Predict the 3D structure of the following.
Amino acid sequence: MQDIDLIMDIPVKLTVELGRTRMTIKELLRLTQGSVVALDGLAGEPLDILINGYLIAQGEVVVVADKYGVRITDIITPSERMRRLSR
Amino acid sequence: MQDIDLIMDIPVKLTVELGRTRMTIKELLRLTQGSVVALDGLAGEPLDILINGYLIAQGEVVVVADKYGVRITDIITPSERMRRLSR
Amino acid sequence: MQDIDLIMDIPVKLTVELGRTRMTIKELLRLTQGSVVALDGLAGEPLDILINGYLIAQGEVVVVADKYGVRITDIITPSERMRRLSR
Amino acid sequence: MQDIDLIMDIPVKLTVELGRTRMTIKELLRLTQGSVVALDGLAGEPLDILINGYLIAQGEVVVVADKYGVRITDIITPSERMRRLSR
Amino acid sequence: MQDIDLIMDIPVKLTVELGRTRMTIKELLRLTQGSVVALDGLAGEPLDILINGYLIAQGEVVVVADKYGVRITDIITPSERMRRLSR
Amino acid sequence: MQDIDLIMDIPVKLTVELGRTRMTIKELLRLTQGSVVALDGLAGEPLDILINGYLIAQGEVVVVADKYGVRITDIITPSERMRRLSR
Amino acid sequence: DIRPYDPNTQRRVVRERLQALEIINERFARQFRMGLFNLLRRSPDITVGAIRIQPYHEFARNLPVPTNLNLIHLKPLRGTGLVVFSPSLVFIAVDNLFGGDGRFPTKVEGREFTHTEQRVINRMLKLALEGYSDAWKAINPLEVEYVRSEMQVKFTNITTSPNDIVVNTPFHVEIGNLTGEFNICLPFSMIEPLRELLVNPPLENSRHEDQNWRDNLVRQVQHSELELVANFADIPLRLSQILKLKPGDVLPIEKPDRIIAHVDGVPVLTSQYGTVNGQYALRVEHLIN
Amino acid sequence: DIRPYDPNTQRRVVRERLQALEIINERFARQFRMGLFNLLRRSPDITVGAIRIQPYHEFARNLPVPTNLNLIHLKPLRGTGLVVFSPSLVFIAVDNLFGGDGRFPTKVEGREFTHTEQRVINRMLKLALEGYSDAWKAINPLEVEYVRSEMQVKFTNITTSPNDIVVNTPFHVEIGNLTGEFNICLPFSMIEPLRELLVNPPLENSRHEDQNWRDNLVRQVQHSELELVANFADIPLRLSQILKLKPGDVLPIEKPDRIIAHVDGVPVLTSQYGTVNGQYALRVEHLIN
């Protein structure tokens, strides 16, 4: 509608997250330069795409001539979103 | 539509601006504690309302029992928006 | 230094923000002429002062003979800035 | 008309802009002699042509026997002008 | 026409000149603070109005509530323009 | 020096400008005989003094027995000149 | 609930009880009673008035004109304190020091204090300063240094704004029919860092025990848990594009030289992505400091 | 709103309250009261009149003829200040210094001051100068140096134009039925650089704190953002050509040896265009200074 066009003039910010993990503060203090930290996500899984910190879609990492890119694959339809938030 | 409902779940940020002004850096350095700085806007004029830094409407300042509030009065329809951006 | 003097000749823009709030787009559509919108900030709190959209200090609202003014009170030293950005 | 002829006797000034970019003042201070600064525009894009600071047309860069020249290609018709100003 | 409307969106600059005179550089060096310099124009004569340094009309000086104003009186039709340029 | 004396023999032209303003061509066409046009400058402000179209000093308007005169007051030192040209 | 905003209006800030401040005031009252009895050769009666929290202008408007105002600094805290002596108390002290019996009631003058009266005020001020310093020492080390004496709010601006919150503790001195009063005013910002110390009642010293308590608290908190999130990169886009996200859509992003690790939106370090043990890894480079 | 212009007319400039100037005037009044009591052996009463802002000619027309005018310089500020002594005050001082009781009313003379009266005026002037210097020292270091004494506006032109704005602070001196008056006049341009210091009320010294405040303000502003625009070249043309801009139209331009970088119309440096990383680049050469 016309208000969709009005908010179209408003820029927004997109965020791509590689993964997430949980650990104690003591473990973080144990970490030093060159330390290795694992993530919950596996290899080849689509990465989360966030708009102002809200996940809306998923994509795959590509490189464009010198720049990283995300190839959108799937959405976060309410059933899947509720399932992943329940975790 | 359904995508309007989808983006409804996405929170946004609103910004209220009292006014704007222009000055040199030397004048800013001259400013000290307790200094007085004027603004382009006059008294009683509606204040700008910004969504993620984009002006969408104007309102008037009110106080709600202990908290400031903005009473929306007018919009920033494209003619007025272009006129005020041309300034 | 001399480069401080050089950039002094360069004018900058100052922005004063009354407050901020978050709401859904559906709530904004529900809003009409004369609607009342609340803000996160309370009454009497110092207002944010922004230079090109970056907060650098806080002040209090005064009126100068017919014109609004801001009476600077405090700064946004890195500890407080990080604390308020974490919110 | 006759007033078009009258203003024809009045000379005007034309400005050609290679490109535009945005950066912080701190980054500018970091810049030294021989520093490299990028621009938003890409390679081969038509350059903006400005009359007294107002964009009216676009052209392509050519060299005339020892002197640079602009080969006009397109106009800034209101739809495109509004689209590029919205950016 | 439509191009008149297009150039209407282009702002222009207007210049009002009180008068003109000719003197040697030695006389200018002789001039000090508070010195008196005469002009060719007489008292009550219409002042020249220039657009980007080109004379197009004449007017009379008025004051608007605190601001000087020019009350347009006559034009610079080609016969008069040639006569005054021949001087 | 001796070349200052040489150029002293060369006469120059001085220009006094009452004020300046900006308007559209359509507004100028709307103007008729007896129309009132405002200026950016206020009442009592020193007028610009131009040598061959270059501002070098400011003065105040006086009348000498039947002839207008300019009473020089201040200069256009580079800081003020840059500040007023930035406008 | 909805009210119109007035820039010339301000609200209050609940209650800020300072039991330690009251204890310091009582100790200073005892010391000053002893000092005044020593000085004037007569036994005074000092009553500690209720501690008051009010804007600076409200305190200023209640001060009789002229009044003796003394500027003091409570080192190492930053600010300027004020000691207020009413003209009646100064007149009583002058009368007592010069053999006056106090039978004659004091007459309103509204005149600047004489240099002899200035010396009387200084004699009172030194003892008051010693007493207050000794009283404050019981809870926290402080040094009081007098700056200058003024007779009007014109010579004030101890505070940036007239509406700034200040703490005023009145004291009433009685050596007979006399009921003289002196006040101590301190800006709230000066005592703001020591708010925790002044609010809760003091306990026994046990400085080693308190240090051990803090060490144990630090040790226990070290085993707490959090969530570490690393943002790969960010993209500026528009909502219309978001409405058109489909499989296979490629969005260009800027290549991040370093990966910044954030904890609840708080950056903690910058690293680089890697592949170790079949999972993504971050090679820590520098901590955010 | 529309009015006809008259070159012999001028307007006013709002209000320019100087609280610091009033405080300096009060301190100078105290010092001068002490000095006059020391000199004339009688207690004077000095009242500070309201500070006045008016054109120079308006101040000149109110001065009785003849009057004692003294030229002073407030170093390091550039200009010439004036100290105005009314003939009545000089006559009162002469009468007091020579045993006159003041019973006889003063007679209008309109005559030049005698050299003895000149020495009386100099004796007053030295004390006034010391007092005013001491009063100004409290807020900013200044030195006052007397230049010469004149008895008419003929010998003036402290100001370039008669309509220049000056600041006049009257003072009323009373040592009985006498109500003598002296004035201090200063051009506005002399105190223009110190306008910020004089307008807002002074605070505590805290010079190190103020320097730290300025340093923090500088540091925070250093992270601000702007827009950098480089103009390739400029062309002089006409509007008729602009109406005929079409695809393929070639317009000759002068080859720029250097590319000037402007920020909101403010040149900052000159550079040369280049092609680096597939995008246009500017090799910075010299900064605009």
Q: What stands out?
A: Chain F touches chain D through two residues (CB under 8 Å). Strands of chain F lie at 11-23, 36-42, 47-51, 54-64, 67-75. The radius of gyration of chain F is 17 Å.
